[PDB]
């Protein structure tokens, strides 16, 4: 039980960091838990994804604030903003590379139920997408293509093996439509995917079990909100 005991300790500490809103610690604890070898349970997957989401979420918000100031820079037009924006950016990139590295070394596999395979491939698209948000050079196309390929393989599994109301399928379609809109600059694909997803989920809404109703309906709300915004603009 060398890993069995240590792994369970790491899971226990990830849950403590969660309660304390210590998401950097939570992420590191869940990364250590993954590397012990075992596959994650549903609950453990969620701890991993929430931990790193909150970590990169702070960096992305900071990067957006700074990048915006950088674009309006005029009473002191010095290198201060670019320098600090590059620091945050390098930090964000390092977190995305850590998550992508963990997905590719331990989590993405050809086995497992459809939920787990879609969950990790969506994560792969998401962190490639975060890289794409800040990419500017000749690597931007590669990063976008990597995000798209991950999202596409996940989409293919979800429509083949999971019901239209499944929260993971729904959250994948939401984030892929955001990719279409913001990253690939294809508002028609974004609108069409969000609308088809929302329409097909509505059709099974009446059958949705309790254990999934909350998550599904929250994502359906986001899908509809994005649609209203994207369509009214066009």
């Amino acid at each position: 039980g060398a890993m069995a005991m240590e792994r369970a300790s790491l899971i226990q500490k990830a849950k403590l960091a969660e309660q304390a809103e210590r998401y950097e610690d939570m992420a590191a604890f869940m990364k250590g838990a993954v590397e012990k070898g075992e596959e994650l349970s549903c609950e453990e997957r969620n701890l991993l994804s929430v931990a790193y989401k909150n970590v990169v979420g702070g960096q992305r918000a900071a990067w957006r604030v700074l990048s915006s100031i950088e674009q309006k820079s005029n009473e002191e037009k010095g290198p201060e903003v670019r320098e600090y924006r590059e620091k945050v950016e390098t930090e964000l990139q390092g977190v995305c590379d850590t998550v992508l590295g963990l997905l590719d070394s331990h989590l993405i596999k050809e086995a497992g139920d459809a939920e787990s395979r879609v969950f990790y491939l969506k994560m792969k698209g998401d962190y490639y997408r975060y890289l794409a948000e800040v990419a500017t050079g000749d690597d931007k196309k590669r990063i976008i293509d990597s995000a798209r390929s991950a999202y596409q393989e996940a989409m293919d599994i979800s429509k083949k093996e999971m019901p239209p109301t499944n929260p993971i399928r729904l959250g994948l379609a939401l984030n892929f439509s955001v990719f279409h809109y913001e990253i690939a600059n294809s508002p028609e694909e974004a609108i069409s995917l969000a609308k088809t997803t929302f329409d097909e989920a509505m059709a099974d809404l009446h059958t949705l079990s309790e254990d999934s109703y909350k998550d599904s309906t929250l994502i359906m709300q986001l899908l509809r909100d994005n649609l209203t915004l994207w369509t009214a603009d066009n």
């Binding site: 989401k53 998401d126 939401l174 984030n175 809109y181 913001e182 986001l222 915004l229 994207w230």
Partner: peptide, 11 residues
Amino acid sequence: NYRRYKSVGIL
């Protein structure tokens, strides 16, 4: 943050 459309992470 300034982004109006949302991804799952906001939840």
